[PDB]
């Protein structure tokens, strides 16, 4: 019924003075990253809620640190995207379509599976971050490339922290 | 692979409540969890896209709202699992259980956004009261209490939105 | 039934060594200021509770800053008044009688009316503050004059902040 | 010398509740106070003596638990006196009113310790619900509320222990 | 039914490399101090809950400061005892048997009696602290002696603070 | 009396960059310094003089802005010296290097104030991109990094101003 | 580019019940102080950036302490001036024209010279602060008098701190 | 060895006040410094030795008092030097300048202690008024301001002591 | 003006179970330290007020750090002495008489002289601290020994910090 | 004493989707920086311990500021290197062998010499940071490039702060 | 260039201890400094390289450990200079004075890492006792006090490592 001020998939001009030929592909990629980070945030939260077993407390905390940091990326990207003249994704349908990894299905999985799913997700996002950071640089959008690099550093760090959790070492003697 | 506990499935809880109590409580908690999760997304969108004469107040207001809703999500998500259920997580399942109609894609004006938020809060207030009542009735005293705690904040958000929408201003 | 240790409108000696001829008129004026600040505090609180409309959130906050700061003046004056050997006003009847402005009537008013009422109140208090500060100085009560000046600075600041809210400028285009 | 108010004795309260309400409430509050006091001691012991592969998490977990239980003790101890009763204090009287079986002397393994803690919390959850229900029923609204507040945290501790005990780990 | 990993009154080796002939008597004394501090903690807490009369608020607070500080000693001793290869006391029976003072009987006593009981308790603990600190030094356990001295300083301080409360001076004119 | 280093004179840096690199870099950095210094003064003025229906939030926004800008001033002035240059400080030189046209004396309406601020941020955005690209190209990695960091914040202030200026409002 | 709502050098009415006969001379003087403090903030900041040599670190810190305190004076004065119904100076020409001291020329001078220039600036401002405070008192603007004295105390304090820096003493052999 | 500046010798101040102004002002400021220094020592002693029924609150009050007084000491000693004088520091000179009679050695009862403290504050109140009036009259606005600020706090300590000494009590 | 409850130089019983044979010599020595630290606090404070020249700022700060740390020692000692059953010195005559070093004469000296006087004071106090700690240990007052060692560590640290200030090195060409 | 899970100088796979062709040279260079920063932390800490003379206090503080900031670089680099699939250096032989500057010999040198040695160290590290950042960018490791630039900015800043300390200016007559 | 004070050269201390006291005391303090410095590096390495089922808590434990050890380093290095000695700083001298055998290069399993850390703490515990006893005996009360304080913390780290290494686990 009600028509929006700016339709989804429509570009407005940005006051930071970058051409639409620059902002359009950047927003396209940023919405994919937004959606992917949003899914990852929900997934990490889920994993915080449901994790159990011998490594419960450490994983419980780790999963919270992850979704809180990922929440930060969501915030940064959604706000910048709008700033660039785009419309950030917010509905379940379009969020699911733009997500760059396959989320864990509903239901509770064991802790190794949860971590593996989270790692695969981070790895998928790492791939998109690099591709999008290279694009931003290429197109002259310096701040975006800088922001993505900032996000990439913490995202990679999250990935190899999961890697360590899954490694084959233990105090079990 | 399949999960160790399916969605919709109930496990036993260590907190000495029977399935007949935990089951309808968890099912209601999931509807509420989905709705809060959907409302967090909506407020956050509004924070991202709001503009105009009241940009700064609404900007900050939407953030306060979604951060407060994030607290409810955490509380409900963890309680639900504690009660022996499986909390809703992903986009498609959230869409299925959300108790209000989420805003369509696209950026709408600030009055429309606030109205959408108010309706969302009202739908949630509706469910909160009924679920808290059910929990009291079934003897889950702590769930009823938690819901009441959340209700107080939720009503407060709702009537704060109402004030923003009210027919008054400094414009003379 | 029970008789007070010190009756209202009765002066005791102060340990800070100022004559009754000094402390009596100073306490008389300070009770008027106490009562006036008490009414203003309640009024600002009211305005915080009831304000609505397009400028809801900013006014909501502003009204709170005001009653919190005014609360501070109430505290300072009530305690000093007792220190000077007087009895601070505390009952509704005498509070209403000593108040130096007309408070807003009961019921909810619009935001421009609320601000106008608050401004008139502050202006009435400003007038009494200057008169009382000049008196204290004149009578040799240095600390009182200093305290009133301190209160006057913040009170005036509150007044012109209300003035700005009511000014004829807007982003409404 | 003899006390000005004996143990088991009720005085009048200034909060306008009659003996017929305050008496059974205080008696229940004492059972709960003793049990929390006994649970604080147990968690603290576990904090002192835990070792093995999950030393650091359990170490910290046991401390969080007893510190949270210390908060309940304070709340109940002070409320009980406020209601006109005498709070249990010493070792032997605590032993008499404790609603669970305390762990024997000696250091046990970490699974046993957690199981003992879970049973302790469950026994306490049992009493909490019944005492809160009694308080609502008798019209002591604030006691019922306080108990609910404590119940929420107590259930949360219980199901956190359950998760630790659950059959899952990173061991592949 | 279930047998412990380490039975109460049984000594394991400590990784801090002190002989059992050293650690055994030290743990024996430390368990007495643990039990005594545990009783004192409960007693101070009780006194916080039940204190009334003209000096209610100050005593209320003081009793809390005491049990919080005593709680700290409990923590330090229980953890070190286990570290030394002993088993800390935790059951009501053995706690009552190892306590070095007679605790106040159940029921509410007046404020002077409560303080006197608390003072006698502190004095009993002071005696054991000195004896045990001298032993630790004598046996070459330097850190224990240091820890006890640290605890002794605060314990003595608590004692003479109670002493002052009970002294025969007052503003009562 | 003569200065240790004259304005416009380049000294060697301890950070191992040739003068042919530091000279153009300091030249640009002085323009940005002067521009940020002017924008700081402008935002501060706006904080002082703003009034009307949106007085309070604009009052706050302007202060957030100048405080953030003062942080850019600090970083650039200090790095410029570090690089072996001399930072501008005087009114005449500031006026000469500034990359936007400053608001004239007088108290303007809040829409005009915001528009002047946007234009100032836009002019600065252009210079930052230019100077960042130059620093990278010359191998002053740290300056390029610093500029990007400042550019991200500057663009953010710019689009926040844009939102304030947009044609939307709660007044229906 | 529209006209200003209030032109520079034009007085508006104040909400705080002071006549234009009072507010006009006060605002004129307040603008000279505003400009002076604004130039001094810049100078101190410059000195923070450029200072080097044997006392680099303490001078580096001292100059920052100074300019941060000066910007507080700026804030207070700019906002008070506006509240009084005047227009605060913000452009480079008029800031240069109203400044009550001669700013240091462009270029990096030695630390002794920098400190001497700062002291001369403080001294010129001290002179103006006293005249203006006296004027405010004289005209019945008690709050402006108070604010000035408050600023004067901090300013004199900076001045004699610089004095000590310049004093003929050191730890050198 | 001889001092850079002898006690009782006036140097010029950088704050542009003639010696005919600073000399009497520093003279009085030294008396206040010595008096506050003595009162600091007295309040501190009282904090050490107080006992009885009101031990704890008096213990606290005395400490609040000396800490506030130490703040007056700091401000006056530093301003006095700033003004071109030399602050008193030695026991003999302190004893000579002090405006009240200090409590003799020994531990007195808490009523006596409080009374001595009141008398000390009263003596100081008199000097502050005198010295503040003088500073104003001589055109040392900032000193007068500082004295008034200190006087407000000092009068407040004085009437707080007065209240402690009043003939009222909970003991019926 | 009534008599003291406990005369100066008279010993009362202590609640901490130490005999007068022990507490008397300990309190005598503790009073000498109390007086010395009291004189040193004054001296360091004086130095804070008067220091000027090339190292004004760091010396200004250092002297404040010093006197604030010294007043903590004063607090600890005054309260411990009282708790032991003695009477702490507070009058100017006896403070001068019990002080274990010669205070700096009145007047503003140079910074090197000020530092040398402070070092000599610390050194005299260091001597007394060691004798008194040894005595406390010897007499079985373990807590006083501990408190003294605690104070000694901080005191020696101040002493060698002054030493470094006075050392024959600088950044001057 | 078992074998290491990953031998020094051996590369493991990284979870962040960078090939060994990329991670190997990056980790090699990162280890040289790790060792260098490790030696510099030690040096700055040493300088904190030993500095004396007329600028004792500010240099004392500056050296602590420096080593604390350097240990943050160490933390970041050690953890990043591991996350990339390498093995961080921690033994004394290899720390000495991989260090990119010559550490100050044992003994306490003068403050000018200490500062010069620190500047030379920073300069050598600045050189390596630039090569390594360029290499990381070149090989497509965007996050390592970003981290290095982040560290470079702080490092250059320390370097020119030392420069100012050494500069030919002072407050001496 | 030659140092102001050569390594192994003793200067006089301002704290009035003869060289015959300070020399052996500084000798031992340098060994402890070197040992703590090495243990700091080792704990830090362990923090970097740890992985597996107990990754997170061990990651945290190692960091708590090295930060506490860095505090011991600071206190000893500074006191050693204060005492008139020269603290070790170079890799070769550090390696020479260290009282335990440091872990070789390479990433070892978490059990090995913990065992190396325990052994290091044990070796250090022995030296601390020796050096503390010596300081007391020589009349350096403050050094003995400092060593005891450090020893208490060191023993605590040691028995915490012991607990981690114990044969208990939640995995049944
Ligand atoms: Fe109910
Ligand atoms: Fe006046
Ligand atoms: Fe000893
Ligand atoms: Fe690049
Ligand atoms: Zn949890
Ligand atoms: Zn935001
Ligand atoms: Zn980590
Ligand atoms: Zn924003
Ligand atoms: Zn949680
Ligand atoms: Zn509200
Ligand atoms: Zn009050
Ligand atoms: Zn304002
Ligand atoms: Zn622990
Ligand atoms: Zn309480
Ligand atoms: Zn209470
Ligand atoms: Zn612990
Ligand atoms: Zn005390
Ligand atoms: Zn800076
Ligand atoms: Zn700096
Ligand atoms: Zn402002
Ligand atoms: Zn000071
Ligand atoms: Zn100062
Ligand atoms: Zn005290
Ligand atoms: Zn130091
Ligand atoms: Zn880390
Ligand atoms: Zn240090």
């Amino acid at each position: 019924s009600a028509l929006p001020r700016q339709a989804f998939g429509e570009m407005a001009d940005t006051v930071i003075l970058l051409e639409k030929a620059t902002t359009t592909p950047i927003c396209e990629g940023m919405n994919r990253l937004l959606a992917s980070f949003q899914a990852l945030y929900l997934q990490y939260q889920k994993h915080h809620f449901v994790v159990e077993g011998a490594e419960f407390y450490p994983l419980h905390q780790f999963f919270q640190d992850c979704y809180e940091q990922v929440q930060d990326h969501v915030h940064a990207l959604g706000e910048r995207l709008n700033g660039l003249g785009g419309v950030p994704v917010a509905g379940f349908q379009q969020l699911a379509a733009l997500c760059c990894f396959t989320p864990e299905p509903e239901g509770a999985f064991n802790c190794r599976q949860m971590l593996s799913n989270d790692l695969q997700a981070e790895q998928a996002i790492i791939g998109v971050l690099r591709q999008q950071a290279t694009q931003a640089e290429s197109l002259g959008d310096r701040a975006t490339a800088y922001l993505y690099d900032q996000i990439l550093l913490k995202t990679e760090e999250r990935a190899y922290h999961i890697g360590h959790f899954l490694a084959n070492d233990s105090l079990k003697v």
Side-chain angles (χ1 to χ4, degrees), chain A residues 1-171 173:
Chain A
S1 198
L3 283 192
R5 287 170 61 86
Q6 189 179 341
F8 192 78
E10 174 196 321
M11 285 300 293
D13 296 302
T14 182
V15 304
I16 73 163
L17 302 184
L18 294 174
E19 291 301 327
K20 280 191 180 163
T22 292
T23 58
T24 310
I26 291 169
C27 285
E28 187 283 321
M30 201 172 282
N31 251 334
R32 287 192 283 122
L33 284 165
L34 176 62
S36 302
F37 276 131
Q38 204 70 96
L40 184 58
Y41 162 73
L42 297 174
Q43 189 152 114
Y44 273 133
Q45 202 169 223
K46 179 197 193 193
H47 292 172
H48 176 85
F49 301 145
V50 309
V51 73
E52 56 176 31
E55 289 82 37
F56 160 64
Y57 229 41
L59 288 171
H60 198 54
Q61 302 148 20
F62 175 70
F63 285 136
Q64 188 176 310
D65 300 338
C66 285
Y67 77 64
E68 286 178 350
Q69 189 178 57
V70 167
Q71 174 59 211
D72 198 80
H73 306 330
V74 168
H75 187 179
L77 295 185
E79 193 150 350
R80 175 143 187 95
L81 202 159
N82 176 74
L84 290 167
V87 183
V89 60
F92 294 122
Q93 203 85 82
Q94 199 73 71
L95 277 161
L98 294 177
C99 190
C100 71
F101 66 94
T102 302
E104 177 178 279
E106 298 300 308
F109 291 85
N110 69 226
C111 65
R112 280 192 76 81
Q113 286 167 333
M114 284 188 283
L115 285 161
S116 292
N117 290 336
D118 295 340
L119 180 58
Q120 291 170 230
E122 298 286 7
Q123 286 172 145
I125 293 162
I126 282 163
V128 181
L129 282 168
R130 296 173 175 157
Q131 194 242 336
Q132 298 301 126
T134 300
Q135 188 180 62
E137 261 208 61
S138 170
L139 291 174
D141 186 355
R142 284 198 146 259
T144 292
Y146 170 94
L147 179 60
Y148 283 156
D149 283 346
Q150 196 174 85
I151 297 171
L152 179 62
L153 185 64
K154 284 164 183 153
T155 301
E156 286 175 357
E157 180 173 0
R158 222 175 299 117
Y160 62 69
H161 278 66
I162 300 163
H164 298 152
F165 266 120
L166 294 163
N168 206 71
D169 194 6
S170 188
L171 278 176
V173 62

